[PDB]
Amino acid sequence: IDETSSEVLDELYRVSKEYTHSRPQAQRVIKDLIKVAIKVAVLHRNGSFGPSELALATRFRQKLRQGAMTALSFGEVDFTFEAAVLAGLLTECRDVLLELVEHHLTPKSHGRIRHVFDHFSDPGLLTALYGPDFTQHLGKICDGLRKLLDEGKL
Numbered sequence: 001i002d003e004t005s006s007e008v009l010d011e012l013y014r015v016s017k018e019y020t021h022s023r024p025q026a027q028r029v030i031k032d033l034i035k036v037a038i039k040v041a042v043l044h045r046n047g048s049f050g051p052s053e054l055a056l057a058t059r060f061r062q063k064l065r066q067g068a069m070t071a072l073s074f075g076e077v078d079f080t081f082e083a084a085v086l087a088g089l090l091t092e093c094r095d096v097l098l099e100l101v102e103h104h105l106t107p108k109s110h111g112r113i114r115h116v117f118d119h120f121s122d123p124g125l126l127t128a129l130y131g132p133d134f135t136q137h138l139g140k141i142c143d144g145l146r147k148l149l150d151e152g153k154l
């Protein structure tokens, strides 16, 4: 696994664990995240996607970059964090991914996608993340996101 991606994944785990107060819950969401990513990766490697699905994958990446850039913008003291906006963007990502894998992955895998995106798009979690107690976590996530965008890994 890519080192920067691992660093961000680590931070997402830590944010989830601290927000929920549950190691088992955080481990579960990150396990599902990893499973989903790899399953989608395999579909890309095996040439399983049709033309409309490949266009959907392109849209998903655009949306994911938009989410990342918006997360970064809200990190600026200048601009006011709006949880509903970031949550809405993450839900747009969820929905594009769900469409992408509708005909390729099992309903169980669709459930894992909903679990991951619904966990992190939770306005409660995001509000905590952008609040006074999560300053260090947010900085590290933003550093990672900026590096991923810079290196073309999103």
Ligand SMILES: [Cl-]
Residues within 6 Å of the ligand: 049, 050, 051, 052, 053, 054
């Ligand atoms: Cl298709």
